[PDB]
Amino acid sequence: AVQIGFLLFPEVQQLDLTGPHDVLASLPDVQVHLIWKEPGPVVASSGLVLQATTSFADCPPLDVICIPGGTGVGALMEDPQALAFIRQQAARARYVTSVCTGSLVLGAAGLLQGKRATTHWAYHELLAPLGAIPVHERVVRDGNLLTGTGITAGIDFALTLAAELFDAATAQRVQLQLEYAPAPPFNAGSPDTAPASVVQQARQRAADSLHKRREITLRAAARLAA
Amino acid sequence: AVQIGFLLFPEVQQLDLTGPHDVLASLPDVQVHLIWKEPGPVVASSGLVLQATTSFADCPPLDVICIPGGTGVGALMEDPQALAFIRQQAARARYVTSVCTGSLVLGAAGLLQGKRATTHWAYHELLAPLGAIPVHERVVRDGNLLTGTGITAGIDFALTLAAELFDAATAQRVQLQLEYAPAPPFNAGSPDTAPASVVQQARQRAADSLHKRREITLRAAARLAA
Ligand SMILES: [Cl-]
Ligand SMILES: [Cl-]
Ligand SMILES: [Cl-]
Ligand SMILES: [Cl-]
Ligand SMILES: [Cl-]
């Protein structure tokens, strides 16, 4: 079976994970893992309780690894066990992927050095200190690396991955079975299309988190510079 | 606080629940419940383990109720306790909503009689026996009833609900914070746009489930006819 793994950490943004999980779990001959330090409950940033299925030590070699984002990314960027596990898996994985601020975890792990990548718009300035070439695009592919932003990015690149792992007809079948055709009632999903007043409110609400993440990012970068 | 409740049942299609959950949980002064017969683990059709937070008896009066879909809908259409709970909450809820085959549960509960509604394309013929006026549209609103199609239908109508519960700027802010700017890599999310061959693979794969659900629907309709 194709082995697909999501990192499941405290304060994950659960939809970053649960979207691609449901798409990829629809495919034949796949096994999907939710990975943490040990199996058991892990609480998402909303309070929704998820369950990790495998420990780092027991996880098989993965064909696909996916790092979701969320407020828990800050701690994960300085979790040496988690970063080492991600590096080990990335060394052999066909696909290394992330959603939203999950790419900052890839960055802290050293996996974005010289690589084109994106992240959540409010945190995009944190890519360059981690060695990345920052790109303002919703999905960015560099070799075996896909980084995406948005709560359907992982669903979308899951359909791309499905087409490459299997074939286009299989990806189309999953899309049709899920009747997946988003049609948002507003056009505020990018800082370039949202009203300026909404952008400002979002920036102000993110300011304390960004400040703390600047500090974390600098320590993570120092470890890479060593 | 505004009380929002999702029915969490065995064999749910978890993304039908987890999408709108993460959107609505981003709003101020909301409380979001995952409802089942008692708190504890409930397993989605993919094998993902979720946790119900409240029992039927302890659930507060809901301002929004949302019924997700999934394999597990068949059993729920003949679960008298669940159907009666849905009816009791729907009687006083500001909004009664469903995703995908969750509308078949609303139908079995008697809540679609004379109402315009949609459901998953492969099961759409089951609406009329439940008293509904079937509508081939991705979202269908009849008063305070909203039924949507597609595994991510609930994210979108969650943004509509956010705008009506609060204001448009709040919904736009949540959209921007989540960087929700969907962009599927294929155009097969409707039987009207997917390749005819893919539509057939999907119809054939659904045939046994539809057959079983025709039987269930007829029994559910008989209970309404009494
Ligand atoms: Cl998105
Ligand atoms: Cl959809
Ligand atoms: Cl807008
Ligand atoms: Cl269960
Ligand atoms: Cl297509």
Author numbering:
A (entry chain B), B (entry chain A): 2 to 227
Question: What does the study report here?
Answer:
Our enzyme of interest is isocyanide hydratase (ICH), which catalyzes the irreversible hydration of isocyanides to N-formamides via formation of a cysteine-derived thioimidate intermediate. ICHs are commonly found in pseudomonad bacteria and soil-dwelling fungi and likely serve a defensive role against isocyanide natural products produced by competing microbes. Asp17 is catalytically essential in ICH, where it is proposed to act as a general acid/base. In addition to its intrinsic biochemical interest, ICH is a useful model system for catalysis-activated enzyme dynamics.
By contrast, G150T ICH samples this conformational ensemble at rest because of steric effects of the G→T substitution at residue 150. Because G150T stably adopts a state that is transiently populated by the wild-type enzyme, it is a useful tool for studying how ICH conformational ensembles change during the catalytic cycle. The movement of atoms along “softer” internal degrees of freedom in the enzyme is further supported by comparison of a cryogenic (100 K) structure with the 274 K synchrotron and 298 K XFEL structures of G150T ICH. The cryogenic structure superimposes on the XFEL structure of G150T with all-atom RMSD of 0.45 Å (Cα RMSD = 0.21 Å), and many Fo(synchrotron)-Fo(XFEL) map peaks lie in the direction of displacements between the cryogenic and XFEL structures. Despite having nearly identical overall structures, isomorphous difference (Fo-Fo) electron density maps calculated between the 274 K synchrotron and 298 K XFEL datasets for G150T ICH showed features that aligned with principal axes of anisotropic ADPs and with minor shifts in atomic position between these higher temperature structures and a cryogenic (100 K) structure.
